[PDB]
Design a binder for these strands. Structure first.
Length: 66
DNA sequence: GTAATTAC
DNA sequence: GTAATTAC
């Protein structure tokens, strides 16, 4: 149960890392997609506000040989 | 404006 | 084609 909190378009949001589908990084910004109920949602946070679990998902994505 | 990527 | 996200 790792909850990621962030604001996207004025709206404050929470998402469990298990619903996160993809994670990448642009500079110091960590952006991702997640399975919103039915549709695919977006969110991003500062590296410094990222919980280790999210950063590990990022580190694995970088090593994916596919 | 660019970074990486997406949903719209 | 572009708004959206954090930093530069």
């Amino acid at each position: 149960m790792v909850k990621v909190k962030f604001k996207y378009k004025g709206e404050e949001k929470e998402v469990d890392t298990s619903k996160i589908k993809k994670v990448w990084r642009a500079g110091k910004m960590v952006s991702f997609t997640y399975d919103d109920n039915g549709k695919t949602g977006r969110g991003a946070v500062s590296e410094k506000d990222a919980p280790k679990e999210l950063l590990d998902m990022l580190a694995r994505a970088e090593r994916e040989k596919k």
